[PDB]
Amino acid sequence: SKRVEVLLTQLPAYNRLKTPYEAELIETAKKMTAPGKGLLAADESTGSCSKRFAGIGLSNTAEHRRQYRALMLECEGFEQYISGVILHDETVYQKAKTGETFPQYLRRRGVVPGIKTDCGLEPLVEGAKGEQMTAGLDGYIKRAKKYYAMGCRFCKWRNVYKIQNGTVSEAVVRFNAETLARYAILSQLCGLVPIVEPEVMIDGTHDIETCQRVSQHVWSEVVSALHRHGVVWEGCLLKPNMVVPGAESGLKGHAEQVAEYTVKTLARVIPPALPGVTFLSGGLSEVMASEYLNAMNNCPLPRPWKLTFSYARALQSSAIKRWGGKESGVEAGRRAFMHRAKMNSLAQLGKYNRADD
Amino acid sequence: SKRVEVLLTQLPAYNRLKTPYEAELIETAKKMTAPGKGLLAADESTGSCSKRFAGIGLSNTAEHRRQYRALMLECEGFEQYISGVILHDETVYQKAKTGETFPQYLRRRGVVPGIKTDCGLEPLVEGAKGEQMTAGLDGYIKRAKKYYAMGCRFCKWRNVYKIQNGTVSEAVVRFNAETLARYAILSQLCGLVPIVEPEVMIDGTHDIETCQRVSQHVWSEVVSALHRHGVVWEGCLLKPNMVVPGAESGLKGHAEQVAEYTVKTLARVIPPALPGVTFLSGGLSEVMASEYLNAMNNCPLPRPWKLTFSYARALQSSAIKRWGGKESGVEAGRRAFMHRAKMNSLAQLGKYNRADD
Amino acid sequence: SKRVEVLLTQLPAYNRLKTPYEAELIETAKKMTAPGKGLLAADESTGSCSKRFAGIGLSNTAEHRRQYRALMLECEGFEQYISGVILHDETVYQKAKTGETFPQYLRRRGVVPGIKTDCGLEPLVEGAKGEQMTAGLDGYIKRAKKYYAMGCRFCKWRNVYKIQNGTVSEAVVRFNAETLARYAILSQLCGLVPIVEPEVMIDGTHDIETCQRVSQHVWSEVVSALHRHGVVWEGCLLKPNMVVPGAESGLKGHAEQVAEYTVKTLARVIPPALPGVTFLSGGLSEVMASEYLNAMNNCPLPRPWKLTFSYARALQSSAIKRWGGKESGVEAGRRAFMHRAKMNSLAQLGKYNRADD
Amino acid sequence: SKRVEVLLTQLPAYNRLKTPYEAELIETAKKMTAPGKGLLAADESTGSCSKRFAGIGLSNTAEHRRQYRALMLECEGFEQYISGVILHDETVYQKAKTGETFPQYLRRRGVVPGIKTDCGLEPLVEGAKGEQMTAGLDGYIKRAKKYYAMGCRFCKWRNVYKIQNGTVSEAVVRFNAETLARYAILSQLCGLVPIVEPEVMIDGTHDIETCQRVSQHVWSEVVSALHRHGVVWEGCLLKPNMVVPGAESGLKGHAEQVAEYTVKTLARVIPPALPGVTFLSGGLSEVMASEYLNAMNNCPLPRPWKLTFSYARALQSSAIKRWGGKESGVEAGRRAFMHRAKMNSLAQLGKYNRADD
C-alpha cells in the first residue's frame, strides 16, 4: 500500500506529555504524600477571605490576609504534619517574618509551596442552570512558569459538579473533564505537579447512593480525559470529594460507610500509578473530616495510592476563631491549628482517635 | 422502576443553546451572505499590519492603521459588494471620517460590522511539533457583549491545522474542533453570529488528495462538536479553506478541479441548514481567489448553502500597493479595491470573467 | 524527531471504505430515488405476516406469503411508481409467475431488488427497560455477498429508539448509531446500497417537540458514526421517521407542521451529499402518509436530497383488504395498491391532491 | 424550568449492569485468582488442534481431542495449581473418565470450568490491512446461558491488535474496545465472569518501547469502554499480553525489564478494583513464560490486582511432546504438565527458580 513517513507524535498512541521536569514532578508528589502528612489549602480568594474574617470582625486588607496566612504558615512545628501548602497568588509574593517570600520560607522549612492556578467558576452555559465551568487556561503557561520560578512546585485547579435532581448534565461531565485534563498537561509541562480537583459537591438533598453514582461517572470521565491528553500519571494527584450524603439530605453517614463508598468508588476508576488522593473536606465538620479520613486508612478495600487530606476550613476553622484577628489570639490560634493538623496527620496513618478530639 | 424528576436540560438531547438573539442571528447571517456580496476581512493584528505596510514603507502607527482601514471602509460604493467587514478590536473604537465609530459608520451604510474575537495561535503542546491551538475563551462573554454593544453583530475565530507528512495529529483535530464549537456557542449567546474558521493550511508539499482527506476529517469533527455543544446552525457560518494542492507541492489546480474537490468535501459534512460558507483565500493569488470562487458557483455538485468569500489579502493586495500609504495614492488604491471587490461579487454569482482581470 | 513510515490507512483521516462497487452503488441509489418513485417495503417476517393476514383469514404458509408478495410485485404497471422493493430473505428465493426468481423478475422489469439484512430487535441490556438493539452483524459479509449474487443491489437494516418519559438513554443513542454505521460500511463493501433506518418510534404520549429533540440527537449521532466508520455518503440512503406527535399523545399535526419540523430537523444533520431520504410511515394512516410526504416536497426549507417513501403498511393495507387472500380479490387488491402507489408517486413530486383520496 | 420524570436508567451515570449473579461473579473471580493458582487455557479450535497434533502425528478426531484434553484435565493433582480451565465448546459436552461431563468433573474436583465464547477473528475492514475484529455477539446471551447451565462459571473472548509500522489504526483500537466491553457486560448478565483479552500481538519487528506505547493506548481504551458499558469491575478479569519486544525484532528482554514495563503499563490504566490479570504467553517459550511471570510478582511497582497466568502452549508444549498421542506417553505427558504447572504456580507466588527448570 501507500505508506508515508510521519512523526510518531502524529500517531494516536504517541500523544504523551514529554516534560523535562518529569522526575522532579514524581519526587514532589511523593514528598506531598509522605506518610502522616497532608496539605493545608490556604488559597482563599480575597473575597473568600471576607467570609473567613467575618465572624472575628477582622477587616479585609492585604496585611490582614498576610497575617491570617502567617498564623498558620509561621506556626513552627506545623511542618511535621503538613507536606505542602496551596497558596493564593497574592501570598506567593508576600513575605514571611524572616523577610523570605512565603514560598522561600516554606521550602527552607521543608514544605512544598503550591499555587491555586485556576481563574474561578463561571456559568457553564451548556447543560443545566446552576452548573459551572472553570476558567483560567488562557495565559496559563506563562503564569505557571512564573510560579515555578517563584519556587512553587505544585498547583491546584478546581472544577465542580452540582447534583440537582439526582443527576448532573452529561455536558458538565464532559466539559469539566476536558478542562481538568488540559490543565494537568500544561501544569506538568511547566514543572508543577497538578492537583486535579473534580468536586462533586455536597450541596443538595441527594443521598450517598446518588453521590456515589455521580462521582463514579464524573471521575471516570476525568480519567479517560487525562489519558486522552497524555498526562504523566506518576507526576499527578487527585483531590476528590468523599462520597457522602448531600448536605440537605437529612442523613449523616458513619465514617466506615463513607470510607467504603469512597474507596470502592475510587478503586473502580483511578489508576494505581497515581501516587495519591488529597481529599477535600467541603461541608464536613472539622471532626468528621478527620474521622472520615481515618476510616479510609483503615478500609480493607483496595487502595493503592496514598489517601490523605488537602483541607482548608476543616484545618482552620477553630484556629481562626481562637486567633480572633489579634496578635493576642495568636498562640491560641496556633494551638488549635496544630491540634487539627495533628489529628489529621494521625488520620492519614489510620491512627486517629476521636477520644482525642 | 426508580424514576426521578429532572430538568430537561439535564438530558443529552436537550443541550441546545437557547439565545434570545436567535432571530437576529439568523437575519444577520442571511444579510452576510446576500447574493453578489461577501466579507472583507480587515482584522489584521498590529503586527500583521507591519507586514502589510512593509512593502510601501508605511510606518506602523494607530493612525496609519486607521488610514489603511479607511482606505477600504470609506471607499463609498464598496457597500454593493461587501456585506460585512471583520474588524480588528482597535478599529472598532476608531472613528470614521464622519466622526461615527467605524461600526456606526458601516451599519449606517448598510454593512454589517463584525469582530475578530480569538486571542491568537499558540503551541498545541499535545500532538506534533508545529501544530497550534487558539486562545481566547477566557473572558469571552464579556468581550463579546461589549462588541455587540458597540454595534458588531458577527464575530470570527480562526483555528489552523498544519498538514505535515501527509497528515495531522488526531489531538489537533479534536482539540481545535472542541475550541471552535465552544466559541460558537458562546458567540451566539452574546448576539454575534459566529464565523467558524477551521483552516487546513495550504502550507507544505502535500497535494490536493491529501488536502481533501484532511479537510474532510477535520471539518466533520468540527461539525460533530458543534452538534455536541448545542449550536444554532441557522445562526452560524463557516470559513474553511478551499481544497487545493499545498503551496510547496509544485502543482497548481484548475479552478474546476478545486471547486469539485471543495464542494464535494463540504457536501459530505456540512449540514444544509448552515446558511453560508465564506471562504478564506490564504496563499492564493488575488486572481485565483476569484476564479476559484467563481467555479464553486458554477459547480454541479450539491451546494445548498451560499458559497461566498471572506478575503483579506486577496481583496487588498493591489490596493495597498496602489495606495502607497499616501493620500495621494488614495484614489488609485480604491479603484483597485473596487475592482477586486467587484470581481469577487461576480464570482459569488458565478459570473466572473477572467478576461475582465 | 523520530519519524516512521506507516500505511496511510493506519491514519485517522484515512479510514474510508474503499469499495470497487462504488460507482454502481451511486448509480443504484440515484435509480432508487428517481423522481415520482419510491420504495415498497415488503420485508415482513413470517410472523409479521401472521399479523398481516389476520384480518383476512389467510393461513400463514410459504405459498400464501409468495402470493401476498406476488399480489404487488406482479402488479404490472406498479413499476412506474416503485423504484425498488425491500424483500424478505424468503422472497429472494421464491419464483415469480414467469419462473424467474423475484429478484430476476423485478430487475427485468426495471425495479431494483433489495433485502432486509438485519436479524431483528433484541433487548439493549444497557440503558433503560424497553430499549432495543438490533442483531445481525455476524456473518454479514457472507450473507450480503450472497444476496448480491442473487441480484439484490441494496439492503435495509432497522434500529429503533423508544421515547419514554420524554427521552431516550444516551446508551441506546450511541450503541444503535455505532451498529448502523458498521452495517453501512459492510453493506457497501459487498455491493449493496445501505438504507440506514434509525427509527425514533411514534409510540408513546410524547409530543412533536419531544420527537424533534430526540430525533435530531439520534440522527446526528448516526451521522457522526457514519463518518467515523468511513461510509461513501453518495452510495448510502436514509430511512428516518417523520417528526410527528406520539401515537398516544392525543394530538395530530398538520402536514405542513410535519414537513417543517421534519425537514428542518434533517437539514440540521444530514450531509447534502447523501442522495435521498425514504421515509418510513410507521403508525401513520395510508392518507396521512401521502399527505405528509407531499408537504415535505412542498417545504421551503432546505432539502437537498430526494425526499421520498419507503412504505409497507401504508402502501398495502387497503390492498390486502380488498385482495382477501383470494384469487378472486386479486384485481381489486391491485387496484388499490396502484392507487396508493400513484398517490405516493405524486406526493414525491409534491403534487399529490387529497381530493383524489 | 421544564422538568420531567424519567427512569434513572435513562441517565448517563446510571448505565450500570445490574446482574443477580453479582456476588457469584465476584466469588468466582477470587477463586480463579487464588494465590499459587492460574488458568489452563485449553480452548483450541478444531483447527488449532491440527496444528497441535502435528508434530506427534496424532490424527485429528473428536476422540483424540477428548484425549488430548483428558491428558491434562484428568491429571489428578493438577488441581493444586490450576484454578480454572478455559474449555472449547466441544469439550464442554464431552465426558470425563468418570462419565461426568468435563465441566461436572472439574467442578467436583475444585476447578472452575470456563468457556471460550467468541466466534473467531475476522478482517476489520475498517483501518489497515492485517487488522482483525472478533465475531460472536449475535446469539450471545443464549449461548452463555446455556454454558452457565452446563456448569461454566467464566468465559473468555479474545481480540487482537497487530502492530505494523510501529503503530495500529485508531479504528482497530476503538472498535475492538467497544466489542470487548459489550461482551463483558453480556457475560456478566448471564452469570459468567468475563476474561477480557485485548492482545497486542508479539508479532513483528517492533521493540519493547513500541509495545508499551501501543499497549498502554489499547488498554486504556478498553477500560474507558468498560466504564462506558457499565461493567462490574469486581466480577471481571483481564488477559493482556506482557510488554515485550516483537518476535522478529531481534531482541530479547530480561524478565525484570519485562515486569517493569508490563506492570508500569498496567498500573497506568487498570482500576485496582479489577481482581486479577491472567497473562497470555503467546510466542514466549515455556521457560520465559514462567520467568516473566515470576518477575512480575516480584516487581516493586504498584500492582494491586493478582498477577497470574492463563497459558495454553506454554503449559502444554512439552507435555504434548512427551505424551505422543499415546496411552503409553500418558504418564510422561503428565509429568511434564505437572512440572510446568508447578513452575507457574510458584511464579504466581513470586518464588519460581529457574535452576528448577
Curated annotation (Swiss-Prot), chains A, B, C, D:
Chemical reaction(s) catalysed: beta-D-fructose 1,6-bisphosphate = D-glyceraldehyde 3-phosphate + dihydroxyacetone phosphate
Subcellular location: Glycosome
Family note: Belongs to the class I fructose-bisphosphate aldolase family.
Principal subcellular localisation of the protein: other
GO biological processes: glycolytic process
Record organism: Trypanosoma brucei brucei
Entry GO CC: glycosome
Positions of substrate binding: R65, K156
NCBIfam families noted in UniProt: FrucBisAld_I
EC number(s) recorded for this UniProt protein: 4.1.2.13
GO molecular function, one term: fructose-bisphosphate aldolase activity
Active site: E197, K239
InterPro entries (alphabetical): Aldolase_I_AS, Aldolase_TIM, FBA_I
Alphabetical keyword list: Glycolysis, Glycosome, Lyase, Peroxisome, Schiff base
Pathway: Carbohydrate degradation; glycolysis; D-glyceraldehyde 3-phosphate and glycerone phosphate from D-glucose: step 4/4
Protein name per its UniProtKB record: Fructose-bisphosphate aldolase, glycosomal
Pfam families cross-referenced by the UniProt entry: Glycolytic
Disulfide bridge partners, by residue number: none
